[PDB]
Every structure is written in C-alpha cells, then in structure tokens.
Amino acid sequence: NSVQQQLEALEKSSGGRLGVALINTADNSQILYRADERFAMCSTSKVMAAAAVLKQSESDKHLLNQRVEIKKSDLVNYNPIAEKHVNGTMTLAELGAAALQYSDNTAMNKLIAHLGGPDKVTAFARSLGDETFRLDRTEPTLNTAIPGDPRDTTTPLAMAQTLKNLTLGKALAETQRAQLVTWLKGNTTGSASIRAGLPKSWVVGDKTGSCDYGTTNDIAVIWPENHAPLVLVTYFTQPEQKAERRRDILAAAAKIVTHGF
DSSP, X not given: OOHHHHHHHXXXXXXXXXXXXXXXXXXXXXXXXXXXXXXXXXXXXHHHHHHHHHHHHTTOTTSTTOEEEOOGGGOOSOOTTXXXXXXXXXXXXXXXXXXXXXXXXXXXXXXXXXXXXXXXHHHXXXXXXXXXXXXXXXXXXXXXXXXTOOTTEEOHHHHHHHHHHHHTSSSSOHHHHHHHHHHHHTOSSOTTTGGGXXXXXXXXXXXXXXXXXXEEEEEEXXXXXXXXXXXXXXXXEOSSTTOXXXXXXXHHHHHHHHTTO
C-alpha cells in the first residue's frame, strides 16, 4: 500500500475527516491528504499569536519583558499557568511560553488583546504570505469547530507552509525564530499525538489542539537524527459535537508519513 492508500484507509476506519500535510525540507517534496480543506484550528492557532508578538519584538527591545497584569476576571476555561499568577503579572514572553507549552487559554487571550484583537492575528498571518489562516474569536469560543464554519480555521498545507516559514524559514529574525523553536520543543501537551508515532529519539517541537466535534490537531517540526527536518500538520475532525478526541489517529498518521525517514 502506498502512503496515500494507507492514509485513506486510516480515515475510512476513523469515523472522521483526516487532514495531513507533510513537507520534507530535503527536497520540498510533500505528502498531502485533504491538505486544502479547512479545519478548525483549536489551540494550534496559539502559534500564530505568539509568533505575531515575536515579530513585534524584533523592533521593540523591551516588548518581551513587558509586564501584563493577570486578574481573576481574565481566567477562562483552562488556565494552568495563568491561574498561578492571579493578582500578579506575567511578561509577554511568559505568556507566549504558557500559551504554547501548556496551551493556557488565558495566556492566548492576553496575547490577542495585546495585538489588538483576532483580526490583527489574521493580518500577521497574511504578512507571512498565509492567505488561508483566519482567527475570528478569542478563547474559548474559537473552539466551537462547527462543520463548515469558516471561523478560526485554516488548511493543513497552509499551516504546514507557515509553520515551516516560522520555524525554519524567512518569517522571523534569528533570535525570535530560535525562541519560537525553543517554546515548541518544550511543549508538554503532545505526548500522545504526533510524537507518539515517531522514533522516540527524534527531536520534536509541536503545538496540539483539541476542541468540539472531536477535533484533534497537532502541528510539528521534526528533526531526524540523520536527515533534514520534516514539517507535519495532522488535523482531524468528526460529525458529532461531543465526539471524543482521537490523538491516536494523529499518531497513526505520523507513523505512516514519516516512514523511511
């Protein structure tokens, strides 16, 4: 079975819609599956917000350490790090780290507010040549993931291209690029997703996403031991609103497309 046949088979048994985009930076070859179809991003959108702040810091040396007050009213549905700092402050850098490494929703909202709203995050994506990404709402409503709803969505290919540009490409200045990579590598939420389908020794940086309609996502940069990096986006969504997440499917897809590498 070809990789494509394996992916189609994987989806057929999954009970959902699978979206895969892998870019092999060795020759820029790609493995695509519904890569031009939109999927709700869930928390994977946090990468774009954090990157937008990193871009700003390129021209503002005091931005990353700027203090941001955390009030009880700022807390939403999931604030593992922000809740520890109520009544205190967090720097924009710490908010970026919390949003990316723990998927803190309060952190995301602080980043969005700092940037001036969801439309500003979309504007940043467009500045990177990403004409697909769109952020419309804040946390937690950006997680509705209603089938066919274009809000807070992107395509696997668009996100793979942008993630490559951000982490290995032309998008950010070196210090900022390295910071984004450091944050992604330090993610604590992706053990069961893409990481679970790769050789245990490979270095990986990723950002997961999980939301309604059993939407299960993960976008990652992978560094094999003897090969050029791979950029992989695995999105998955289902027809029922309260469907369970299926991180096992993302792991399975990762194993299929990275085979041989």
